[PDB]
Amino acid sequence: INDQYSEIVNHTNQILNQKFHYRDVVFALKNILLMGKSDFMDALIEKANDILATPSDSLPNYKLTRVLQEAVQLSSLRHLMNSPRNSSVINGLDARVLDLGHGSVGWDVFTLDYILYPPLSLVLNVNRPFGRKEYLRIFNFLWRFKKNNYFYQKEMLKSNDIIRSFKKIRGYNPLIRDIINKLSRISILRTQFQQFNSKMESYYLNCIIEENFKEMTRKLQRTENKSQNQFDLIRLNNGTIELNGILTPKAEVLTKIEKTLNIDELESVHNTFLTNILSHKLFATNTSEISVGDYSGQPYPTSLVLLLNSVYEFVKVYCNLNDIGYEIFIKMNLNDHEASNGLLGKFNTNLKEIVSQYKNFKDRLYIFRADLKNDGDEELFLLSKSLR
Amino acid sequence: YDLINVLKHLQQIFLGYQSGHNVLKFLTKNMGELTKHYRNDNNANYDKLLQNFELERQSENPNNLMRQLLMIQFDTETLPQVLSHYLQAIYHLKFDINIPYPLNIIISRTCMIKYQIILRYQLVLQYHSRLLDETWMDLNKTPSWKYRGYSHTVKRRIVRATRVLHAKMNHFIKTIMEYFNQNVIDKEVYSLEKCYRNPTLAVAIQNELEGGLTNIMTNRCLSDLIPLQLQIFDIVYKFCKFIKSMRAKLCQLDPGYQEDAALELIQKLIEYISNASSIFRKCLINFTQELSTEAAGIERVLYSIVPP
Amino acid sequence: MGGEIITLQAGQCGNHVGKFLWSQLAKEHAIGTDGLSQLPDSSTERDDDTKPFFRENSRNKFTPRAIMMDSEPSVIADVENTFRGFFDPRNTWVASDGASAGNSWANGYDIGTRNQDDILNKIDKEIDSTDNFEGFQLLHSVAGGTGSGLGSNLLEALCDRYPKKILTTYSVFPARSSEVVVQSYNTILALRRLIEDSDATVVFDNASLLNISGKVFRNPNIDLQHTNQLISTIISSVTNSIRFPSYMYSSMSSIYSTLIPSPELHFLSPSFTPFTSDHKGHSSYDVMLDLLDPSNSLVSTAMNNPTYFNVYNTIIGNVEPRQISRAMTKLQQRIKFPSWSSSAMHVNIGRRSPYLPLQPNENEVSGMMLSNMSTVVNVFENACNTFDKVFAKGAFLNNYNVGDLFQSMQNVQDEFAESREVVQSLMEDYVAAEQDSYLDDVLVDD
Amino acid sequence: GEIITLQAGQCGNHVGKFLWSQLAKEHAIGTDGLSQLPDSSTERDDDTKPFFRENSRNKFTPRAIMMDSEPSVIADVENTFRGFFDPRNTWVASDGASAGNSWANGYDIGTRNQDDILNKIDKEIDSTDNFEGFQLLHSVAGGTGSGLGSNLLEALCDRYPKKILTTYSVFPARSSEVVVQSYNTILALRRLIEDSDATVVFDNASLLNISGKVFRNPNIDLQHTNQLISTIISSVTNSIRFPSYMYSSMSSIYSTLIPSPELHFLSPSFTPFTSDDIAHKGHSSYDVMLDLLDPSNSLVSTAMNNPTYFNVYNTIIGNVEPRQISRAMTKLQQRIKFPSWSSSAMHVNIGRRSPYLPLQPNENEVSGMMLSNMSTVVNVFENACNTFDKVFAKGAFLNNYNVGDLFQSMQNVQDEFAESREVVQSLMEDYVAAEQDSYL
């Protein structure tokens, strides 16, 4: 029994690594659905700007297929799709929209999916029709960040354009010079928003996901090596050092095979990785263990997504403002220097709106940081401190 | 399994046996921080020492099992306090090892406790000796201290007395170390080595090992005399810090140009030296008193102190 | 957005900089000195991106992207003959006229008014090779003439032709007060454009370059040409993230976006531990505290009374994230900043090049920092406090060829007036931003 | 813990030959520079790094730097240890000073060439990380050698502030012609006086006597003198080369010996059991400690009269008993006397026998050696010094070896000599004042 078990488990691990590309689909899932290798997502958004914002339904799916085509083409991940050996991987990608309403909620429901097949569909836990769709929850939760990034970049560029444009006025009415100061100061305001976003994002992608993925690959990988140290040692989070296994004799001649993983361990470890991601204090929604903090009484993800939506409205209004500056330049540069400037009235109105939203933002953020300091947990405490 | 070399590997970590090499390296690297950290170590923030040890351990031989399981740990209650858990802030650090698979039936946990305590004491002494040695190196090398015709009062009262008391302290410290290591430690390792010859009963081996360790612990030089040594260490620590300061302090005492300045500084320096010296005389006399009040350390430690 | 970069090489020193730079770059990706693949095709998988900088043909030769500038074909040809491949010979450019430094800025300016009429077209043809282009670059030393003139004309010519396109600059500042009869002229002229054309600028101080080089080089003290390779080492750490893609900052735009607030403040002081060249066993903790060290800078002229506005940090190597958390704690506890800020310093953890001649690293890292701090104008004060004393006297006021700008001495004198006003307004704004009420222009309205 | 050794002059390099010979066969190397152990995989029980540099192919390069003027004598050693010594470490002059010259021309040559000598020592320094100090091995009588030693001694001391220096010095037996060298000798002291941190002195009368006692059939045994010298140096560094509990750096050794740096001249003694008929007279540690106090064991022939001791530091190597050593101090504190203004300072440094020389182990065999600080050290000065108090005024043959940094400008020459002798007088009166109980 011992011999057969050893032999069969060994051959199974070997065939998984060598024929169906295990450990290439895992890294592929991290580099596609869990938001890593961001350049792919950047290129996707860039090539699908016209459609993610389409205010319509019954959308042409063919264009999205072309989109995934040229997306995997543009990113570094073309190095996969180019190679015959692992070309199979790229085939599994697909994109979806769920229509619960008319108004371009596709951007609010755009979903990237990866369909598996036997044998791998049995070993890896993915968007099973009767699962929890954890990948989908994570992917939406991070797609929010990505929407923020895209809009902020575009409009930052248009801003710097317009400030550079008005710089050539100083032989004219200094009221236009006022614009400069206001816009410049206004610009700082926008940055105070945007940077905050990135901060949280980094934490998410570098203290929640990545650490877990590194642990999963470490455990799944330890079986691969040969003894670089003859002590099968474990290093802990508390400095504990423990040697498991038997202290074997040193090849002693008194008188005259290592532990790899079967199928259940594979499915077990992948599920552990996923659930330990979603049991973190920055994702949990609906248990008894949704401990709320002082000064707010709300779930952390709920308040955070409120912050992010507020960020979205800020981007919209700043877009309007920069637009306003653009047509002001348009009417100024031409003949009508007796230009009606109720546009300036709109300018002041929108500044008032912006400053209102910004004061509300700082207030909510102060509530947020105080909430995390109330939490007392070391990593959340340090996140709170870093935000200052 | 080669029990002999594993015991020797343990000892070289926990008794210093033939490893003073290692202790010198460790102290010379980390003394600049270990000197000052032990005032407010409640908020640990000791990332640097842990990280540095982690790095240095990677360099060592992998064919030594024991060095691999070496961990740096801290705690709060001090050395005499942790001995108060045995029979009812200077260097409150710690080394421990979780002995491997249940072949460790040879090596208990109580033995590891006592080994920990012993290493703690050794590091205390070695730290103080390293300070004194750096001080000696400073007193005879920095040109600031060389005599180039200054004032007979300053030599009579500042530099010569400083040297005299420094040498006194160093002689005492080295004498303490000499007694301890020579007439305390070699007994146990020698018995343990001799019981490796003609081995007949495992239980006798275990009993002898623990007996040697306990016989190390029973010495009142760790239990009853220890507050004397800690007050000693306070005095010597403060004096050595003062001298390290003097290295740059002396710069403004000579041809600011004696300009109604540093005259009270000279007087205060004289008094500081005098008071520290007198304190140390009293403390050595009381150490004499307890030595005489009630182990070849007798007529071994007392030779360098008994005043002429 | 996020794609290909085109770099520009201004002058002879800059062209040396670029030669060393591309040495280091092609070393990182294991690229053959002649431009053919230095890797056996046994592996077909590749896990980094060279599309932003290079182009490829049916014969798997890497065509670089760059432009090499002067009127003297000596340095260009030296670089070319250094690598018998590794460059396209059709992307260089040389003029045919008189040669001089200094106020030949003006003639150099005229070079463009004579020659850019086709030069950018070269650029244009090249830019038509790709689809997604996100920005240019420039390497320069402010002090020299030909480079300064061509760089300023190029910046002006590009700022109005390719909108929504980023232009970064790399500029080094001299330490000698000798040529100040003409030197502090060109410098000031150059600033006039770096205030209206650059989208972000990094500043270097040759005095600190040589000081650090002598401090760290285990060979005795030698020339600056062997110190040049300490420039590219910084430009490796930038664009590291877009060469070995990872979680964040896979674009250049986002990089200065986390560096640069409102466009008036675009001067950046680099720094890092030059733990390499072309050891030191430091952990992450040591690196991220050594970057605080006042001895560690590439513009080391400031008094320890500074004010940071923005900080970027990076690390190359495998790192424990906990050390980053602790180090952010420590650094925030030790640095100063205006009270209108809510963000902080940022950290990106990069990927060490994997084709490198590697031994086991054992958590030994290579740090780096850019800082937008208040003290950059300090490196200016020497040239701030020199040219005007000569302007009262006008030494070398005639070294301008007429062109179509040097017809009236008043023309030149007005140029200098405008320039000094520009730089003075710059320093005014940097000082004003330090006070906690900078936002009053919009937060005290009725 | 790296140590850099400087050897100079004919005597210095003869010393180096024998010294590195004993050290090497103490560390299982042989004349080639490879391991003599049958298994390279097994770990070792010492650290040879403090004296030897290591490469990939397991060749050990002694970090020894040798100086000369006539390369013949320094050439013999590599013609005995092939491929052992690095030849770039030697330095050879051409047409320099006269045979047996006064130190002056050697000092001139040293001032001329110290630039490249300093570059050499710097490049050997760069080879390592943990540098502890230098060592200097030479005689004072030799002209070019002592001039070079003085010049480089100044160069090291002023360039290098944080590094210890230890020098070993050789003095001729009281004889006839050294009335020039002894003459010359005085100025040499000037440097060691101010620049040396610790130093131990050697005379040839007691060396010849030891030879007359140990080895049979003596004809000329200067080689035996070098034997004893190397014996002493290796014994001193034993406790550093084979680690033990306490002393693992050189500074820690001397720090017990030297009060204020006006008293740093040390006098050795050693057990009759040698290190090159040896089987006798090694009876016991009790015996070793006792017979250490025999004046006949001194490495400088002095007189015995109620000697006054400053610092006693002895080391016993081998398998020892606690009881013997205990009783030994028990009566030596009573017998040994020291000035009443300080306290007793007796230190023992039990060490290790080297487990790579196939020794002949007995159960209680030991050897021992001792360093001390004396008043009688000044006795070695007077023997030479008294001489030039009688002759220097005449100067007929004295000036002729042209003893000065300038030639024939004898005014500055007498200036140097007078300042030197008065500095020596300061030393002597200083040791007397430490003697004369005046601070009591």
Ligand SMILES: Nc1nc2c(ncn2[C@@H]2O[C@H](COP(=O)(O)OP(=O)(O)O)[C@@H](O)[C@H]2O)c(=O)[nH]1
């Ligand atoms: N860092 C560095 N700077 C240099 C070097 N050589 C020259 N420079 C600087 O470059 C400036 C000269 O620029 P130059 O090459 O004459 O400009 P060009 O005439 O337009 O090519 C001087 O101010 C120098 O300080 C070098 O090797 N390294």
Ligand SMILES: Nc1nc2c(ncn2[C@@H]2O[C@H](COP(=O)(O)OP(=O)(O)O)[C@@H](O)[C@H]2O)c(=O)[nH]1
């Ligand atoms: N150390 C040592 N010195 C010796 C020995 N035999 C003789 N000497 C002295 O060592 C000195 C070496 O002088 P040195 O300058 O090296 O000889 P030179 O090069 O010919 O001038 C001579 O004055 C000898 O008197 C010996 O065995 N050991």
